[PDB]
Curated annotation (Swiss-Prot), chain B:
Family, as annotated: Belongs to the GST superfamily. Pi family.
Catalytic activity field: RX + glutathione = an S-substituted glutathione + a halide anion + H(+); prostaglandin J2 + glutathione = prostaglandin J2-S-(R)-glutathione; prostaglandin J2 + glutathione = prostaglandin J2-S-(S)-glutathione; prostaglandin A2 + glutathione = prostaglandin A2-S-(S)-glutathione
GO molecular function: dinitrosyl-iron complex binding; fatty acid binding; glutathione peroxidase activity; glutathione transferase activity; JUN kinase binding; nitric oxide binding; protein serine/threonine kinase inhibitor activity; S-nitrosoglutathione binding
Residues at which glutathione binds: Y8, R14, W39, K45, Q52, L53, Q65, S66
Keyword Mitochondrion found: yes
GST C-terminal domain boundaries: 83-204
SUPFAM superfamilies (UniProt xref): GST C-terminal domain-like (SSF47616), Thioredoxin-like (SSF52833)
Protein name: Glutathione S-transferase P
Job description of the protein: Conjugation of reduced glutathione to a wide number of exogenous and endogenous hydrophobic electrophiles. Involved in the formation of glutathione conjugates of both prostaglandin A2 (PGA2) and prostaglandin J2 (PGJ2). Participates in the formation of novel hepoxilin regioisomers. Negatively regulates CDK5 activity via p25/p35 translocation to prevent neurodegeneration.
Residues with PTM N6-acetyllysine: K128
Organism name: Homo sapiens (Human)
Domain GST N-terminal: 2-81
């Protein structure tokens, strides 16, 4: 550290890493980039892939939401106990990313006409995570192993935003439901999730959720 | 017999990079081929974590997700940077490669006819970041990150190779990426693999488009 998050005024792809930093008692600065400033062109041109989030860890500058998650996971010890668990953590995170991409596609490019098919396909997209929990200590701990990992924060956010998109989508999944309640009750995380810093930001940037 | 097993369709696709990595690192593995016919039966698909392939086995460890397999081999074979900082940079490159691969896959499988012209026009802007990364790493004379090969190099190399097939000459605007492809492709073990029937007789994608 110190840490700096450069992003638009939305939860979006920074929600998970923010929950991670908060829950881990880490301090960070938020560099809010408005759409007007972004349309100016300067910042965008300076970004490796022309996109945000941009992240600063001391003299290290990173791009890509999952790179930031993996970096924090690596440096803060939120990546499993060994190589085998690290691979499982990646497997979970990549699955979370795949569904997040589908969610993003729906939200920004086909909300009106595609929501119905998306919601109907949702149960089948969520079950893999319920299954993973079922195979790990009866789903009483974390998504991988017995310690929290960066994938837990990413999965938690994925679940929270889907409950908004399709209320009750976790009702058929007891382990996932209990998991969300358990993680959300962690002291620092609970405080962060209740803060206006989180609550007063829209999930996405187009007013849809 | 070998500790590694690759379960995939009869295409290069999302297994091309990990196969190059394994071959170039002198590792032995088994290929278990899944026909579209067997896939349509449904049993295997239902048994896959996210209902998709590739599926990878390392002893009794069963993995899914192409990038998870790349990171796993990167971790276990020492192709993930020399320190924590490099590891993050390697991830940054791989995520960038994955982003473009996703766009490539979308074009190939869902909008080849009507979307190819636009895709090729936007291609230079999508490749530039990698040229930039090379330019900032020892003049682009070594690898994408640091002075040692990483799993991201194999993924990037594949990305570049398939784009040369899609848009011949697309690397003429990028001297470092061009020399990079030639240099890595010339690595003895990789060169042999790339020229072998095991690689050549497999199509890039599964729908006949490239
Ligand atoms: N693979 C990247 C994607 C980053 C991204 O999509 N950034 C968007 C905002 S979040 N959208 O769902 C962005 O910077 N958009 C502005 C632009 O692309 O000009 C990542 O950070 O995970
Ligand atoms: N994020 C996953 C994607 C895996 C994937 O898309 N697998 C396809 C074949 S490769 N397609 O570009 C697959 O299993 N398709 C069959 C199906 O989806 O029923 C990965 O392994 O990177
Ligand atoms: Ca830990």
């Amino acid at each position: 550290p110190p840490y700096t998050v450069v992003y638009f005024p939305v939860r979006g792809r920074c929600a998970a890493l923010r929950m991670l930093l908060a829950d881990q008692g880490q301090s960070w600065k938020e560099e809010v980039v408005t759409v007007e400033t972004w349309q100016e062109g300067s910042l965008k041109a300076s970004c490796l892939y022309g996109q945000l989030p941009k992240f600063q860890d001391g003299d290290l500058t990173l791009y890509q939401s999952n790179t930031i998650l993996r970096h924090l996971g690596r440096t803060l010890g939120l990546y499993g106990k060994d190589q085998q668990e690290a691979a499982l953590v990646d497997m979970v995170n990549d699955g979370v990313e795949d569904l997040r991409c589908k969610y993003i596609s729906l939200i920004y490019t086909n909300y009106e006409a595609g929501k119905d098919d998306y919601v109907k396909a949702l149960p089948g997209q969520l079950k893999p995570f319920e299954t993973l929990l079922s195979q790990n200590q009866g789903g009483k701990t974390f998504i991988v192993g017995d310690q929290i990992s960066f994938a837990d924060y990413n999965l938690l956010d994925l679940l929270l935003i889907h409950e908004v998109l399709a209320p009750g989508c976790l009702d058929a999944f007891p382990l996932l439901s209990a998991y969300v309640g358990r993680l959300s009750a962690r002291p620092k995380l609970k405080a962060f999730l209740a803060s206006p810093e989180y609550v007063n930001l829209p999930i996405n940037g187009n007013g849809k959720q």
